[PDB]
């Protein structure tokens, strides 16, 4: 079901096997790197049941600081090979660039699992130039790049927020407003697994 869907949940505890398989996974995790949001420990990050989410497709994993290394560890642990690395160059509205060096970019690792067939590889390049609209937000250009890469397929975003919900995407995060599911396969398995609608333990 093409229109946006989401589940407010603790991603540590959700049984993601009910969601099916996805052509693209994207995660912008709250890595534990003095932050204005709750985080996941390195072990919680490692233990995420990413492997059940895809058979053949791509993973987009935002990383910063020491998560440039921890993110690579997780990516490999979850069964992906890192095959690309997108950078978003942060600009203002006049298209100017916003420890040892000031930081002008954010990094997104691109992992592959299996042997994806029928994707449009090489349409976009690995550099995003876009304005920092709101702090802590990722640039909306990434969704368009992913859609041209894999048009019409099911996608899932972990640790997203309400402004991230998108057609063809299911968005998970603990600040979303309730549960909004339209795919009948997913609705059926959700009711089975969560008959009283609560996601605990």
């Amino acid at each position: 079901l093409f229109p946006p869907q989401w589940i407010c949940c603790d991603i540590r505890y959700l049984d993601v096997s009910i969601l099916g398989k996805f052509a693209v996974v994207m995660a912008d995790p709250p890595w534990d790197i003095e932050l204005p949001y709750g985080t996941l420990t390195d072990d919680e990050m490692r233990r995420l049941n990413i492997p059940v989410l895809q058979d053949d497709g791509f993973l987009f994993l935002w990383v910063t600081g020491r998560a440039m290394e921890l993110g690579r560890e997780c990516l490999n642990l979850w069964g992906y090979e890192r095959v690309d690395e997108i950078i978003w160059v942060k600009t203002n509205q006049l298209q100017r660039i916003i420890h040892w060096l000031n930081h002008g970019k954010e990094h997104c690792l691109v992992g592959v699992k299996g042997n994806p067939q029928g994707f449009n590889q090489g349409l976009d390049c690995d550099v995003i130039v876009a304005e920092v609209r709101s702090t802590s937000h990722k640039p909306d250009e990434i969704y368009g790049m992913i859609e041209r890469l894999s048009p019409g397929t099911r996608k899932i975003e972990l640790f997203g927020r309400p402004h991230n919900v998108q057609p063809n995407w299911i968005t998970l995060g603990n600040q979303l407003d309730g549960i909004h599911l339209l795919d009948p396969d997913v609705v059926a398995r959700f009711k089975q697994r969560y008959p009283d609608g609560i996601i605990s333990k």
Binding site: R72, V83, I97, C125, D126
Partner: protein, 236 residues
Amino acid sequence: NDYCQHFVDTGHRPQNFIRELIRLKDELIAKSNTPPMYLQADIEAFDIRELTPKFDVILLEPPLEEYYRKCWTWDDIMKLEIDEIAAPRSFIFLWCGSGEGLDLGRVCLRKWGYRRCEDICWIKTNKNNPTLDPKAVFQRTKEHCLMGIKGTVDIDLIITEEPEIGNIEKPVEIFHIIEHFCLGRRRLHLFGRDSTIRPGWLTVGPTLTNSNYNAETYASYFSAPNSYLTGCTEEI
């Protein structure tokens, strides 16, 4: 405006549309710089331990096959004994390319005892001319230079036009970033060329046409009272 969509429509890369003095520091650097020193050496057969003294900064630029539409694999690079010539407190800048080097270069840094503190991206514009590795998902339009540290003004971006094919030179701007860190005066550039020789640097590589390296002469530049200068201070 969506420059990713625009690149798909036109072939103009999104980076094509990116638009105090700090010059007396550059003059201090210039005054403190040792004479350029350089040595032709086939690094696969050469015992790097003959390169003394131990270096404050190492710039490592192995010729990767991806640079070409003698090449060094990451197998070769990983087996260099860089830790044997790095000072206990010292820095490394490793050009890693755009493919498997972003991973294997991190293995190298840890193998040699460094931790990465920066990831410096050379973003290449194509303003003047609006490949595909089989594993690539996207067109690769940048190269990474990883900064490693061991022991206890600028931006992490360099933007220039993509060089003509077969030109493997890296932007000279990388030297400016390194020298502005004021990390010390023993600076080694492995796999440099005649074209990269520079005051303040010892350049070692297989394609150099001439050498002037003398270990005792070189060490004499850093004998007391000049052993701990940052390279951004006045002469003593």
